[PDB]
Amino acid sequence: MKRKSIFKDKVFLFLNAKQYKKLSPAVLFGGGKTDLLMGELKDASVLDNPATCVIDVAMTESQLSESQSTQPWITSTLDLLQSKGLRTIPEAEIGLAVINVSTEIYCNPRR
Numbered sequence: 422m423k424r425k426s427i428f429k430d431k432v433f434l435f436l437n438a439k440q441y442k443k444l445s446p447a448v449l450f451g452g453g454k455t456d457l458l459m460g461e462l463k464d465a466s467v468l469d470n471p472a473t474c475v476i477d478v479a480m481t482e483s484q485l486s487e488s489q490s491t492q493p494w495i496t497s498t499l500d501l502l503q504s505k506g507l508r509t510i511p512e513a514e515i516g517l518a519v520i521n522v523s524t525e526i527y528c529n530p531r532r
Contacts, residue, residue, distance in 0.1 A: 428453025433474040436498065439494040439496055439510060440478070447519060459498075468506040474530040475502055477509035507531055 429452035438456055445455040466475050467492045480493040499509045508530040518527040525531060 425450065425452050427451025427519060427522070427529070431472050431474060432456065433476050434458055434467065435476040435512070436509065437476070437478050437512070442496050443475075444512060444515070448515075451519065451524075462502065462505060465505045468502070471531070474528070475509045476515065477505060477511050479513035481511045481512055481513055 422473070423492045432454035433448075433492055434452045434456050437445060438457060441455070441457045445457075448455050461467055467475075476495060477499060480495060480499075482489045483493045484497075510528050514527040515524075518524040
């Protein structure tokens, strides 16, 4: 049977209000913790601590063929979170790591 220790001793904040409703139970079956807030970064303790993350949308799906008019984008919030202290990890890499049971560096915001 599949691993049940995907994010066993980790928590995250998701920067998305819709995919969250399935990512939450998926990661809970994965053993980990999830929250939905986009302004909790008001204080950087959510980045400084060793086991919290912030989750970006699958913005990595953006095709160079039409990037001028593609809806997903590298919004300033990603760079602001980098400036605070952490990466905003794409949900797409969570899906890959859930498929392969390999939450090693795919979904690590601090590395």
